[PDB]
Amino acid sequence: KIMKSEVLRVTHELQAMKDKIKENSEKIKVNKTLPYLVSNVIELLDVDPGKCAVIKTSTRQTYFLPVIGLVDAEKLKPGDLVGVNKDSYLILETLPTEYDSRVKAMEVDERPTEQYSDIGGLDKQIQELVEAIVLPMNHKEKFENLGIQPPKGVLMYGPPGTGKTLLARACAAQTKATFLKLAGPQLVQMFIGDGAKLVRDAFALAKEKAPSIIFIDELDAIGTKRFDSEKAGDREVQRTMLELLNQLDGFQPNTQVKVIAATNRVDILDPALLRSGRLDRKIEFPMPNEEARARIMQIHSRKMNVSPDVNYEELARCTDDFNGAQCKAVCVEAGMIALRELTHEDYMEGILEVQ
Amino acid sequence: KEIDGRLKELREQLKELTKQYEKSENDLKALQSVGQIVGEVLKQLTEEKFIVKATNGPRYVVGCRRQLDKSKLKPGTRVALDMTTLTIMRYLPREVDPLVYNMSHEDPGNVSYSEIGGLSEQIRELREVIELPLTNPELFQRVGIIPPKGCLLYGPPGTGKTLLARAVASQLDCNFLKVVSSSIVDKYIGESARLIREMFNYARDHQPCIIFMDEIDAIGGRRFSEGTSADREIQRTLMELLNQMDGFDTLHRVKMIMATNRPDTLDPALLRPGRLDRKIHIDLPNEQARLDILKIHAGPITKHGEIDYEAIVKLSDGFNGADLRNVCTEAGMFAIRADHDFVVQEDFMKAVRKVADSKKLESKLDYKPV
Amino acid sequence: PLLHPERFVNLGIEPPKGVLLFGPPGTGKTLCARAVANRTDACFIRVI
Ligand SMILES: Nc1ncnc2c1ncn2[C@@H]1O[C@H](COP(=O)(O)OP(=O)(O)OP(=O)(O)O)[C@@H](O)[C@H]1O
Ligand SMILES: Nc1ncnc2c1ncn2[C@@H]1O[C@H](COP(=O)(O)OP(=O)(O)O)[C@@H](O)[C@H]1O
Ligand SMILES: Nc1ncnc2c1ncn2[C@@H]1O[C@H](COP(=O)(O)OP(=O)(O)O)[C@@H](O)[C@H]1O
Numbered sequence: 133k134i135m136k137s138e139v140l141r142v143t144h145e146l147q148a149m150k151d152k153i154k155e156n157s158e159k160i161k162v163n164k165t166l167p168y169l170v171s172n173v174i175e176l177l178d179v180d181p182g183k184c185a186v187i188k189t190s191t192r193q194t195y196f197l198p199v200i201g202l203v204d205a206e207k208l209k210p211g212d213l214v215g216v217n218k219d220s221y222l223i224l225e226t227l228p229t230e231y232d233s234r235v236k237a238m239e240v241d242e243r244p245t246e247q248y249s250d251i252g253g254l255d256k257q258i259q260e261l262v263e264a265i266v267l268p269m270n271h272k273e274k275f276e277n278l279g280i281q282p283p284k285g286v287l288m289y290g291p292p293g294t295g296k297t298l299l300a301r302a303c304a305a306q307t308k309a310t311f312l313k314l315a316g317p318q319l320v321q322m323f324i325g326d327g328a329k330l331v332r333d334a335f336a337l338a339k340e341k342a343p344s345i346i347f348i349d350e351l352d353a354i355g356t357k358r359f360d361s362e363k364a365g366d367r368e369v370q371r372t373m374l375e376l377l378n379q380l381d382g383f384q385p386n387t388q389v390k391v392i393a394a395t396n397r398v399d400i401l402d403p404a405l406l407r408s409g410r411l412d413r414k415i416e417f418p419m420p421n422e423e424a425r426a427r428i429m430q431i432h433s434r435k436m437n438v439s440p441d442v443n444y445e446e447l448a449r450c451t452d453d454f455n456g457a458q459c460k461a462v463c464v465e466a467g468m469i470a471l472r473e474l475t476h477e478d479y480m481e482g483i484l485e486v487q
Numbered sequence: 488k489e490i491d492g493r494l495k496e497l498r499e500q501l502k503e504l505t506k507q508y509e510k511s512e513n514d515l516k517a518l519q520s521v522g523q524i525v526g527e528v529l530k531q532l533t534e535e536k537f538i539v540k541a542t543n544g545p546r547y548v549v550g551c552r553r554q555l556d557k558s559k560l561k562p563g564t565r566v567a568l569d570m571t572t573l574t575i576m577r578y579l580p581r582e583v584d585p586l587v588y589n590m591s592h593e594d595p596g597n598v599s600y601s602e603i604g605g606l607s608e609q610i611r612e613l614r615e616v617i618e619l620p621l622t623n624p625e626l627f628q629r630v631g632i633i634p635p636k637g638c639l640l641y642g643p644p645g646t647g648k649t650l651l652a653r654a655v656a657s658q659l660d661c662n663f664l665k666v667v668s669s670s671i672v673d674k675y676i677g678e679s680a681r682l683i684r685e686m687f688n689y690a691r692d693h694q695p696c697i698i699f700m701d702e703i704d705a706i707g708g709r710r711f712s713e714g715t716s717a718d719r720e721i722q723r724t725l726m727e728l729l730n731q732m733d734g735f736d737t738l739h740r741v742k743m744i745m746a747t748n749r750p751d752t753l754d755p756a757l758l759r760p761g762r763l764d765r766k767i768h769i770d771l772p773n774e775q776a777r778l779d780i781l782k783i784h785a786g787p788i789t790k791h792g793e794i795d796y797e798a799i800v801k802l803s804d805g806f807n808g809a810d811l812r813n814v815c816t817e818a819g820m821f822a823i824r825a826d827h828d829f830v831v832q833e834d835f836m837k838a839v840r841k842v843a844d845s846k847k848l849e850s851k852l853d854y855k856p857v
Numbered sequence: 858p859l860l861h862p863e864r865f866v867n868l869g870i871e872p873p874k875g876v877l878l879f880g881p882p883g884t885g886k887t888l889c890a891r892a893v894a895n896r897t898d899a900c901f902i903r904v905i
Contacts, residue, residue, distance in 0.1 A: 135494035142497040142505075149507040156511030159518055175585030186525065186542075186582060194542040196525040196567060196579060201517040210585030221522025263820075283816065324717040325672030328705070332670070358851040360749075367752055371705045374748065375669055378701070381649070385595070399848030404644030404748075406845070408812035414845060436869035468873045471863075 160202070160217075164225050168218040169193070173210035185223060187216050195221035228340075232333035239313045240337075244301035250431055251295045251302060253424030253456065257415045258299055261286050262306070264413050265390050269307035269343055275387065285380060285391045285410050287351065289398035290417020293455020295428075296394040300347045303392075310342040316350035316394075320369055327372035335379045335389070343388030348376075351393040352400040373404065380410045419455055422448035429459040429479075436467055439475040447479045458483055523567035523576060530562045537575075539566065551575050584686045591665040600654035602783060603647045603808070605776025612638060612767060613655060617742055621695055635764035637743035641750045643853040645807030646769040648746045652699050655744070662693050666700035671724060679720065680727040687731050687738070694740040704747045707754045725754065733762050750857045768856050772807055774800050780808040784815040789822075790830045802839050805852065814838040859896045 172188030178198075183205050187195045195216070200208060203223045208214060215224030230236070251258065268275055268282035275282050288296045304311035314334060319327040338344035348354065355373050356366035366373075383389045391411065395401075398414055405411045420428060426448035451459060465482035466473075526539040532548055534557060540546045549566070551557045552574045559578070560566065566575045600610060620627065620634035627634065640648050656663045664686060671679055690696040706725055711718040732738065747753065757763065772780065778800055785794075803814070817838035822830045846852075858864055858872035878889055886903070893901045 133490045133494070135490045135497075138494045139497040142501060145505050146501055149501075149505040152511040153507040153514075156514050156518075160514045163518070173585050174582045175588060176580060176582050177588075178580065184579070188542075192543040194525045195522050196565075197517075197522065201520070202514055209589050217517070217522075220517050220520055222517045222520065280819070322715060322717065323672075324721055325669055325705075326717075328669045329672055357849060358854060360851075360854070365749070365752065367704070367708070367749070370749060371669070371702070374702045374705070375667075377644075378649075378667060397848075398845075399850065401849055402644060403807065403809070403846070403849060403852050406849070407645060407809040408816055409809075412813055412816060433869070438868065464869075464873075467869045471868065 160220075160224070163217050163220060164215055166218055167215040167224050169195070169216040169221075170212055171214040171216050171223060172212055173208070173214070175205070175210055187221070187223065189216065197222040231337050232329055234330055235333035235337055238330075238334075239315060241301070241311055241313065244305045244311055246298050246302050246305060248299075248302045248306065251298050251428075251456075252431065253420035253428055254294070254417060257417065261288070261299070261413060261415055262303060265345070265392070266303050266306050268387060268390070269309055272343070272387065281384070281387050283408075283412050284383065284387070284389070285393070285405070285407075286413035286415065287393045287395070287398060287405070287411045288415050288417055289351075289395050291396050291419060291455060293457030294417035294419065295456045296417055297347075297349075300345060300392050300394070304345040304347075307343070307345070310338065310344040312338050312341075312344050312346055314346065314348040316348050317353045319354060319372060324368075325371065327369075328375040331372060331375055331379065335382060338389040339383060343390070346389060346391045347394065348391065349394045351395040351405070352397055353395075354393075355401045355405055357400045358402040377404060377410065380407075384409070419453060420459075422451065425451045425454060425456070425459050428456050429463040432460050433463040433466065436463075436470075438470045439466075439478075442475050444476075446476050450480050454483060461486075521569060521572075523569050525565065525579075526568055528560060528562055528564050528566060531557075531560070537566075539568065541568075549573065549575050581688075581692075582685065583689055584682060586670070587664065587666070587682065587686050590667070591663065592660075594653065594656040594660055594663065594665065597650075597653045597657040600651065600658075603650050603654075604779035604783065605773050606647060606651070606769065609640075609651065609767060609769060612765070613651070613744075616765070617655070617697060621740060635742075636738075636761075637745065637763055638765040638767055639750075639758070639763050640744070640746040640767055640769055641748065642769040642856070643771065643807060644748055645809040646772075647808065648701075648769065652701070652744065652746070655697065656699065659697065662696055664690070664696055664698050666698065668700045668702050668705050671706070672720075679724055683724070683728055684731060690738060690741045696741050697744065698741060699744045701746050702748070703745050703757070704749050704752055707747075707752065707757065709752055709754060725757075729757065729762070749854060751854070766857075771805060771853075774804070777803065777806065777808070777811065781811050781815070784808070784812045788815065788818075788830055789828060794832050794835060799835060799839055802843060806842070806846065810842055810846070814842050817841055859899070 169187060169189035169191065172186075174186035174188070174194075176184045176186070178184035180199065183200055185197055185200050185205075185208075187197065189195060197217075197220075201222050203214070203225060207226060208223060211229055213229040214226050216222070217224055248258070248262075264283060265286060272282075288299070290296065301311060312334060314331075319330060321327045321330070334346065338346055354369070354376070356369065358366070360366070380391060393405070393411055398406075406414070419425075426444040429447065429451075430444055447462070451462065454462070462479045462482035465485070466478040469478050524541060526541040526547065528537050528539040529546060530538045532538050535550045536548055537550065537557075537560065538546055538548050547568065549568050550573075551560070555575050555578065560575075565579045565581060567577055567579060568575060600613075616635055616638055640646070640651075652665075656665060666686075671682070673679065686698075690698060706721060706728070708718075708721060708725075711722065714722070732743070750758075758766070778796055781796065781799060799814070803810070814835065815838075818830050818834035821834040821837055822828075864870075864872045878885060889901060
């Protein structure tokens with residue numbers, strides 16, 4: 133019949149078709165290899181009597197490239213930092229935007245290396261939040277097939293030194309995904325909308341980089357208990373608080389980028405963040421008991437081999453009302469004095485030094 | 488058949504494909520495409536002379552050559568110019584606030600507004616402020632009055648304001664503008680009130696626009712003593728907003744729905760009648776309303792007919808529907824524990840007491856109403 | 858640590874993580890200068 137004529141056209145019409153964009157792409161990719169004008173998209177949905185665009189150039193110019201001749205506006209959503217022709221004055225290609233100066237890299241660790249073994253004492257709580265955070269990362273498809281969207285907001289409250297920061301980074305390392313840390317106590321900015329702008333680009337950065345871990349510290353500092361006096365009514369910080377609120381539902385579909393909020397006293401929050409779709413998993417972080425404190429400092433001093441056969445039982449007796457941070461300070465205080473004490477007696481003075 | 492079926496493979500691979508030679512030409516067409524400079528015609532000098540401001544550079548004057556329909560061009564229209572061709576080669580309409588456009592045209596798939604209980608009074612308030620003015624202007628014509636402008640919602644942070652805003656947004660999904668009232672700040676001194684005028688002009692273009700913005704307290708304030716340059720930018724932004732919504736020229740068929748958490752710190756100039764026609768406080772959910780929300784949240788839950796909902800109502804008090812999906816959730820991974828297919832009433836009791844003990848800690852759960 | 862004779866093995870991994878040589882206006886930073894002279898060419902800079 134009629135194949136051999138059709139495909140001798142088709143395969144020829146396939147390869148020559150693709151070769152000319154290979155020529156063209158080059159002809160525009162060198163232009164895409166030389167863009168010079170930022171894309172302050174001031175869009176018009178100019179339906180041809182489809183779309184169109186206005187580009188505020190870097191040199192303070194504006195160029196109305198018709199119908200956006202190269203990039204679809206579905207991916208070319210407005211903003212800035214999207215390739216524009218230096219000669220053709222056309223949109224060239226999307227490229228990463230700017231992450232609000234501070235948010236570009238505030239304290240973002242690319243990959244944490246702390247392991248879950250070096251932390252402990254609250255193993256029931258750490259396993260609880262691993263099931264609520266780490267499992268929604270590795271076995272995310274299990275939740276997708278089950279039909280239950282995993283919760284995202286985990287609030288980890290407890291006195292300082294309970295290992296919240298290590299646990300959050302250890303969980304992020306286990307997920308093998310992006311980890312973003314927020315300096316909560318310093319989000320209160322005199323500039324208007326600055327903290328609101330910072331949190332936005334932090335969420336934007338987290339969305340653009342994998343299912344991330346948004347580790348916001350000092351949630352009590354971020355959100356007041358609404359105890360309103362004229363001394364301070366939490367007026368300008370209510371700005372940023374509801375901003376964090378409206379970005380908690382930004383990642384509801386596909387259930388990525390979890391929010392972990394660390395504080396000491398959960399009671400200093402109004403019933404805004406304690407929401408089921410918002411921060412819902414509140415996990416207690418108590419001071420470890422004598423057994424847990426002894427185990428924690430033993431794990432810390434595992435990399436130290438100076439004094440053999442130290443059961444740390446007297447240390448557990450003398451470690452009354454101490455944090456995991458205090459236990460680490462106690463053990464490394466031995467790590468500073470155990471030169472040339474030594475066994476079961478170079479540990480007490482660590483707490484005494486701080487006060 | 489070998490000469491038949493081997494054909495049916497090869498042309499399908501293309502069709503949508505092998506659509507490259509013209510894409511190549513189009514982008515080559517772009518390569519030698521002239522980029523025509525863009526300005527706004529301030530005023531028409533003569534019938535053939537038109538005073539046009541470049542968006543950045545100086546005002547030039549240009550002139551349509553033979554057929555560019557100089558009559559339809561108006562002071563403030565958008566035209567394309569070239570520093571070489573000396574004329575306007577074609578004309579172009581306007582803009583639509585793109586950043587605002589997508590974040591106001593990306594309303595997620597929500598449920599109907601009937602899926603939230605205890606706010607039927609608020610639902611009918613929304614109907615007689617949005618639907619009634621446009622469906623039946625003849626009755627109000629016999630009345631002889633203008634429809635009201637806007638309504639305010641305020642109360643505890645957990646009421647259903649976001650659900651109601653998303654539900655009304657999903658009702659239209661085409662002429663609904665969502666504003667978060669915080670992306671107004673930017674690096675430059677400009678583009679603060681320029682955007683605000685722009686979607687107001689967008690609201691002028693489309694009559695039945697429903698404008699929703701949240702946290703008026705994020706721009707409101709009471710009074711700035713020893714104001715900073717950032718504080719001073721609020722007050723001019725607030726003043727520009729006030730004189731563009733009430734001002735001298737009013738809007739038509741445009742209604743503003745706004746919500747916040749601190750009604751007392753709001754500026755008294757905005758909340759006076761004329762700008763905010765109605766003020767509505769969304770109170771604590773009722774005990775039977777909480778029962779309905781609990782049933783809604785426990786719809787797709789594997790459970791049998793032994794649940795003591797009345798016990799939950801008696802124990803759970805002062806808890807918004809937010810705390811109720813927590814209880815529904817907390818019963819969820821309690822059911823995950825020990826690997827139980829169904830959910831037992833004891834899991835709900837554990838959820839209720841755990842949430843109740845969670846809520847004990849926090850004080851000042853709600854601001855007093857004004 | 859600058860001599861690096863024992864930090865690696867006998868004592869835990871790394872030497873003590875820092876030094877806070879504080880004190881009322883007086884001997885402060887003179888011992889730092891003495892340690893700088895006693896050590897290698899990797900010598901301090903005085904920032905305020
Ligand atoms: N133990 C000391 N022996 C000899 N001279 C000393 C001693 N302590 C301080 N001085 C003298 O004090 C002066 C400044 O001392 P040093 O450099 O320690 O302090 P500094 O940097 O000026 O500040 P501060 O006094 O606040 O520590 C120098 O003239 C130094 O000779
Ligand atoms: N379970 C633990 N295991 C190991 N180290 C711990 C543990 N708990 C606390 N730490 C120590 O505490 C420090 C973290 O302090 P911080 O983050 O301020 O406390 P919190 O997270 O309770 O606010 C770490 O340097 C770590 O050495
Ligand atoms: N009246 C209600 N009916 C049903 N669900 C509610 C209600 N109030 C709150 N919720 C729950 O709270 C979440 C929505 O947050 P919402 O309270 O609307 O925020 P805001 O009060 O700031 O608008 C949803 O997960 C929803 O299940």
